[PDB]
Design a protein around this ligand. Structure first.
Ligand SMILES: O=C(c1csnn1)N1CCOCC1
Ligand SMILES: O=C(c1csnn1)N1CCOCC1
Length: 185
């Protein structure tokens, strides 16, 4: 792909984080803690899942960023509406305001409803995410495999400002402690 020139500097918004997440000083890395991280509750925090939003809001233009997923067993990545549900249980779908892909149990899937099987020969260590607001497109790229396309959501109905979306996943197995990291431009 040739989307690299739309690169944006994403930082994580601590106030939206699930209370077990640990975000680095530079706000560029996040991991699952093994306990509550001693923060007060607020209406922005994702309560049920290890999720956090980017601070940036996008309402126009073309945007690109990259995320490092090295040695993780489970995660979700993409974008979401600023007004997605924070509390209780929900599925990641465009109907609920999410445009995402994930790794779970050794398979990759796009967060359509129902979910769509992805075809990835080279397990990615870094994922590229491209948003074209005007066109209604969210695309995902395998940076480990020379930028090959993973998935394109088209005919998106964003219906609001968009925020970068992250889920570090649970660590029930003891094999999923590694962080998500925003990669440098
Ligand atoms: O259920 C758990 C849990 C215990 S161990 N893994 N996570 N929660 C509830 C949702 O916020 C994160 C902590
Ligand atoms: O945004 C939507 C949408 C809103 S409700 N269901 N459809 N999408 C996402 C991109 O793939 C096509 C459908």
């Amino acid at each position: 792909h040739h989307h690299h020139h739309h690169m944006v500097h994403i930082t994580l918004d601590r106030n939206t984080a699930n209370s077990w997440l640990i975000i680095s000083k530079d706000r560029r890395q996040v991991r699952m803690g093994d306990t509550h991280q001693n923060v007060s509750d607020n209406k922005e925090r994702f309560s049920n899942y290890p999720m956090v939003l980017g601070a940036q809001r996008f309402s126009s233009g073309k945007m690109y960023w990259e995320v490092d997923v090295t040695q993780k067993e489970a995660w979700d990545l993409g974008v979401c509406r600023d007004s997605v549900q924070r509390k209780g249980q929900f599925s990641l779908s465009p109907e609920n305001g999410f445009w995402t892909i994930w790794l779970w149990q050794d398979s990759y899937e796009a967060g359509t409803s129902p979910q769509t099987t992805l075809h990835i020969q080279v397990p990615p260590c870094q994922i590229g995410i491209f948003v074209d607001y005007e066109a209604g497109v969210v695309s995902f790229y395998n940076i480990t495999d020379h930028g090959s396309l993973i998935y394109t959501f088209s005919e998106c109905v964003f219906a609001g400002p968009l925020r970068p979306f992250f889920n570090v996943g649970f660590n029930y197995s003891g094999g999923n402690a590694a962080p998500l990291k925003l990669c440098p431009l």
